[PDB]
């Protein structure tokens, strides 16, 4: 009753007996949301399959050990981290992507409290095309990722097959061919190599990195799809105009029924095509999430003899960090 037609009486009256053609649209949209939140819950469940943290774990105090920097992989302080939600690396990732969950709720909140009209989210949300926040906020997923990353190094080890991070990289690098006689005498070089890798990864988002390219492509694709859907309401569709007031005011209320029937079924079939494409895209997202969970429990938590899967080359480790609408991996 919002995107189909505006807040009028003539459009809503005709949508009584003809309203059965939108029930399937609402049901398929609810099914899409069901697949989305169920996959999100499954991802949150697989990120903590066997974690075991410690009660006396001060994330803000104890966050660095064995010459490896973990400041960017820790994002909580005190017993309850309410003020601090994400880590430093997640902050750098979310700084360039302002259309996140917090960004969406901030743009929707600052629509009636007083601001300047410079975004299309206010016109999108007032036409029935709104973006509800996920069942799990980005802070909760960031905390889950932080807990997994911390548990992978501090005892008891969960995401490192029950071994320290330095021992994990030393034992994993042996599978490539190099013996421990060189690794034991060059542990400082491995530590500084990891620190340099993290620094290059953190400073790599300033340029035209591939991660921000696909992240902004997904965000821009969703925004473009919503904008194109909103522009469909402005389409003439063979009628004299697109506004409902003009068609229900200039024309008579008795002879405009057959003329408005084609416009209303055109908008309904456009909505059906949009929800069909949305279902296909969401299914592709579900498959991508399945691959992401496979990598999380196959290359991050543990390691198996697979070639060119966890990294294009001689893969060693693969850290995990939350990203806007997806996950980010560090294929070392």
């Amino acid at each position: 009753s919002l995107f189909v037609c505006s807040n009028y009486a003539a459009c809503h009256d005709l949508l009584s007996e003809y309203g059965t053609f939108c029930d399937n649209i609402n049901s398929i949209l609810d099914e899409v949301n069901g697949l989305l939140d169920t996959t999100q819950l499954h991802v949150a469940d697989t990120l903590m399959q066997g974690v075991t943290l410690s009660s006396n774990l001060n994330t803000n105090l104890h966050f660095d050990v064995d010459n490896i920097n973990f400041k960017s992989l820790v994002g909580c302080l005190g017993p309850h981290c309410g003020s601090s939600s994400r880590s430093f690396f997640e902050d750098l990732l979310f700084d360039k992507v302002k259309l996140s969950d917090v960004g969406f709720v901030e743009a929707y909140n600052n629509c009636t409290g007083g601001s300047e009209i410079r975004d299309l989210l206010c016109v999108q949300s007032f036409n029935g095309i709104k973006v509800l926040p996920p069942i799990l906020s980005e802070s909760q997923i960031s905390g889950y990722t932080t807990a997994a990353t911390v548990a992978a190094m501090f005892p008891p080890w969960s995401a490192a097959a029950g071994i320290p991070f330095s021992l994990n990289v030393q034992y994993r690098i042996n599978g490539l061919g190099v013996t421990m006689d060189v690794l034991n005498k060059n542990q400082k070089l491995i530590a500084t190599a990891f620190n340099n890798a993290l620094l290059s990864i953190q400073n790599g988002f300033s340029a035209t990195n591939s991660a921000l390219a696909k992240i902004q492509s997904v965000v821009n694709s969703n925004a473009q799809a919503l904008n194109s859907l909103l522009q469909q309401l402005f389409n003439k569709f063979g009628a004299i105009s697109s506004s409902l007031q003009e068609i229900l005011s200039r024309l008579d209320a008795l002879e405009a029924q057959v003329q408005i029937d084609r416009l209303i079924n055109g908008r309904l079939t456009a909505l059906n095509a949009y929800v069909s494409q949305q279902l296909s895209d969401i299914s592709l997202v579900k498959l991508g999430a399945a691959l992401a969970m496979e990598k999380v429990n196959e290359c991050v938590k543990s390691q198996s003899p697979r070639i060119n899967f966890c990294g294009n080359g001689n893969h060693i480790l693969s850290l995990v960090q939350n990203a806007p609408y997806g996950l980010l991996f560090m294929h070392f």
């Binding site: 819950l41 949150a44 469940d45 903590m48 974690v51 075991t52 943290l53 410690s54 009660s55 006396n56 774990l57 104890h62 799990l136 909760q140 889950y144 807990a147 548990a151 501090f154 005892p155 008891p156």
Partner: peptide, 15 residues
């Protein structure tokens, strides 16, 4: 609501 919580223990972190 939190769907899953980590298994906290009363053991030390350092060695």
């Amino acid at each position: 609501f939190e769907p899953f919580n980590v298994s906290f223990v009363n053991d030390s972190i350092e060695s």
